[PDB]
């Protein structure tokens with residue numbers, strides 16, 4: 351199935367011109383799309399109906415779209431509408447031309463402490479908004495923290511996001527709670543954030559190994575080592591964020607007010623040079 355040059359929808363009746371290829375993920379291709387009337391650029395997510403044959407797969411996406419539709423926050427990827435077609439499902443999103451924190455990390459390795467502060471603060475502010483709206487991301491990673499031209503963090507990929515419907519709800523359908531199938535809520539996002547902060551400051555993920563089975567065992571037994579080179583203040587925060595007990599992990603609200611975010615220089619802006627070299 352060939353993707354149309356002009357993407358049209360019955361609802362808004364706006365015309366989107368399919369342009370520059372931006373990348374793919376899980377056989378879902380993404381393109382730089384331009385509104386043929388207003389001339390504003392968006393990231394057009396194109397996913398084929400041949401991938402969503404099973405009603406199980408149709409659902410997921412419907413939950414993903416529903417959750418993302420509700421969201422509006424300067425640190426969450428802007429959702430600007432979706433529409434079906436004969437062959438494809440098109441999702442219109444805020445465009446992030448500067449890839450993700452994963453591409454930055456692979457190029458930079460261990461970043462400077464002030465950079466970690468900047469990136470984490472914006473990400474946590476994003477996660478706080480999600481948690482205040484009873485949304486758990488569940489898949490927070492460097493590859494999901496997208497960057498725009500101004501180097502602002504935008505959280506995306508809600509393909510594993512859920513809504514907490516009631517108080518004290520534990521979910522059964524990566525943190526130790528999920529691997530043990532014991533039940534989880536908001537504190538799985540804090541765990542992931544701890545992994546991210548570790549990876550930014552150290553240069554490598556805390557549980558990474560060549561074997562997938564060995565990685566899961568280390569998570570279960572809480573086997574990681576924050577190197578001696580890391581600032582004790584940052585080291586203390588990581589250990590609390592990655593606590594074996596989900597209850598002893600800090601809430602998203604007390605993350606911002608931690609010593610780490612107040613002890614040293616916290617830049618309010620970052621230049622695009624941080625993609626390749628230290629500032």
Ligand SMILES: *c1oc2c3c1C(=O)O[C@H](COC)[C@]3(C)C1=C(C2=O)[C@@H]2CCC(=O)[C@@]2(C)C[C@H]1OC(C)=O
Pocket residue numbers: 372373374375376377378379380393394395427443444445446447449450493494496506507508
């Ligand atoms: C599924 O929601 C999104 C994406 C997919 C996908 O197929 O891969 C990537 C994400 O990789 C983890 C997709 C295309 C991307 C986005 C997305 O929401 C981003 C949101 C804002 C943006 O600029 C997008 C479209 C970039 C894109 O990630 C890549 C590969 O650049």
